[PDB]
Design a protein around this ligand. Structure first.
Ligand code: SAM
Ligand code: SAM
Ligand code: K
Ligand code: K
Ligand code: K
Ligand code: K
Ligand code: MG
Ligand code: MG
Ligand code: MG
Ligand code: MG
Lengths: 379, 379
């Protein structure tokens, strides 16, 4: 057996605030101009949200309203919680997209033949260990943060504040390249709280009302290690406790350390940025291979050069979980998918303003987004 | 055979500027106070460097001088290049480290027993495909950017500006889990340039003076694909062309997509932040296993909880490249290394102000930093 650990963070973790704001800006632009070019970074620290980056769009967007409404949704609505959407500073340093990039990527190009918005590499991954084809470690870690937000928002644990982190270590066995979860070895939960609640009341609630509500009992046993509020005190939180930036939770956004990552952030970027569109397409290819019965676990790499539509490379790694060779699976992928960004946008409907919904609790394995609906493969 | 692609970026890429500034700030603090607690994020956009984060230190640091001297070293010294250290804005939004974090991590603790500064997961990787135990893809990509900076700085290609990106695709064969590079399949180079030089002069120089100077001729052939200045024009660059943030090149900083990554950035953080110290220690463990003759290729995962000194989990994956089981290699690691941050700091000398040197061209595989010198193993 072996251990593997993944983490997740809540909606009010300062980096995740930034990813949600960046995607609220992108959605505000796409609601008016489906062809907006957006590269919006967000920085958060005590009292401040700064927007920086490049946007060329026909939309008229009220940045103060978009930013403040996203922070209000997260739950930072009073100085007692360390941040307040009503009274924080919002600073904007947004300029047009560089004309040199625009001319090299999309200007005067037919949409299917638009060039990749940048160079880079991206990976897709899928594993049959869960129905949603995601690692159990990260699924559990995300659901523990979702449960904390539910209990905060329904008033069950009114001492909870929006900033949280979780981490799950699962003990696995291997089976011919596929992985089989056996038990939960360790869980960590840290969550911002009010000044009145004591450590013992929080530790008891985190075990009884959060962990037992999320983790199947079969995975928990007498030896499971719990680190609940391990720092001992977490009253200061959100951007006051730790600066946040967009694109600083890229492993939380994807596979929790499993598979691989090419380094590109997702949030704040329109479809021409292949860091997002091609990673979404690669997840769609990986999940299509697993739900199609071709492998039990698979990693897909793709890469691009700025201004060039077709990927430079495509690679498939099946961990030994298919009777077909990796070259055969590559040929099936090449016959069934077109991974130009200007075709991915049509297959995955990537001009639709649903990106803020992807910016917490992972981009993959939930809510039947287009990249989660397998493509029936012909071979 | 299969393809694999990795990228790198130059010193003047806007994200890399931020990592170098964050580490210049950390070094300035450590020069005066070896025990400084530093979590410095940097944001860059047209005309601006913003510092945000938390620092508790006894040092007296002139942030305007530190920031401007780092930008001067990178080479942004005139408005014609799109950024100038003499005249840009430097904004500081730095506060003390949260007292709640300080009390839960290090306050009143014996140094060897300091808790991890945060939770998280980290990986180390090593491969025998190169003497420095790094993937050839990323080594080549880094050296192509280093060669562009050398030719810019020696006046050979005076039209070059500091912002660059490269990407290398290598065609490999597998050998019992180990990987063997066969040839370079594709190279991309994009680099900011002056308004006078034409595309053909730049493409010819990039092939003849950069690629041929860096890539062994045995790997290049008649079928090697070159995408040199593929956007066609890159005069606007640096932070004017694209906002930069610290910790947005975490795959460039590590293994180029090989191995795995736990998501944590390195730059701007002191040793108590296990995202940096434990990733460095994990690279040291991986390279020690490969140089010790125990495996040909290996991935090491570790994880931590905030306030807890010992790792929560340790895992070793050898890809089938050892006669010893992964459990045996884990036992050898556990007998030879102590992965508490307050012991890693002593083994790797992590209070020394050498971090700006790590913040471009990768943290691993070069210049015999302590984590690159193997530990002789007893078993
Ligand atoms: C510990 S901080 C990162 C290190 C920090 N920048 C410093 O100055 O030491 C990382 C994340 O952990 C969580 N956090 C903040 N304060 C915490 C505390 N007192 N205990 C536990 N977790 C905390 C928040 O989710 C925060 O965004
Ligand atoms: C293309 S930009 C990222 C997308 C961008 N934020 C936008 O608004 O479309 C990414 C990086 O590529 C490089 N770059 C900038 N302008 C470029 C151009 N005209 N051609 C090629 N590469 C460029 C720089 O290294 C830059 O930091
Ligand atoms: K990726
Ligand atoms: K931070
Ligand atoms: K890592
Ligand atoms: K950017
Ligand atoms: Mg962070
Ligand atoms: Mg990138
Ligand atoms: Mg970037
Ligand atoms: Mg982290």
């Amino acid at each position: 057996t072996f251990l593997f650990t993944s983490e997740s963070v809540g909606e009010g973790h300062p980096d995740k605030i930034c990813d949600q704001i960046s995607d609220a800006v992108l959605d505000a632009h796409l609601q008016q101009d489906p062809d907006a070019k957006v590269a919006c970074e967000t920085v958060a620290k005590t009292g401040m949200i700064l927007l920086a980056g490049e946007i060329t769009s026909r939309a008229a967007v009220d940045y103060q309203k978009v930013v403040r409404e996203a922070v209000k949704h997260i739950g930072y609505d009073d100085s007692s919680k360390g941040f307040d959407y009503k009274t924080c500073n919002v600073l904007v340093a947004l300029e047009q997209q560089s004309p040199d990039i625009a001319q090299g990527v999309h200007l005067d190009r037919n949409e299917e033949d638009i060039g990749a918005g940048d160079q880079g590499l991206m990976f897709g991954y899928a594993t049959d260990e869960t129905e949603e084809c995601m690692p159990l470690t990260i699924v559990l870690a995300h659901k523990l943060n979702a449960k904390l937000a539910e209990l905060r928002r329904n008033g069950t644990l009114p001492w909870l504040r929006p900033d949280s982190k979780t981490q799950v270590t699962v003990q696995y066995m291997q089976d011919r390249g596929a992985v089989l979860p056996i038990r939960v070895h360790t869980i960590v939960i840290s969550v911002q709280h009010d000044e009145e609640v004591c450590l013992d009341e929080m530790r008891d609630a985190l075990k009884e009302k959060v962990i037992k509500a999320v983790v199947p009992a079969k995975y928990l046993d007498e030896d499971t290690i719990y680190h609940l509020q391990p720092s001992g005190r977490f009253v200061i939180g959100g951007p006051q406790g730790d600066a946040g930036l967009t694109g600083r939770k890229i492993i939380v956004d994807t596979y929790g350390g499993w598979g691989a990552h090419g380094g590109g952030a997702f949030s704040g970027k329109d479809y021409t940025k292949v860091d997002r569109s091609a990673a979404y397409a690669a997840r769609w290819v990986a999940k299509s291979l697993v739900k199609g019965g071709l492998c039990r676990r698979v990693l897909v790499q793709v890469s691009y050069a700025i201004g060039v539509s077709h990927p430079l490379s495509i690679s498939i790694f099946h961990y030994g979980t298919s009777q077909k060779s990796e070259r055969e699976l590559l040929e099936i992928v090449k016959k069934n998918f077109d991974l130009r960004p200007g075709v991915i946008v049509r297959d995955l409907d990537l001009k639709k303003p649903i990106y803020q919904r992807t910016a917490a609790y992972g981009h993959f394995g939930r809510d039947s987004f287009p990249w989660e609906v397998p493509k029936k493969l012909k071979y």
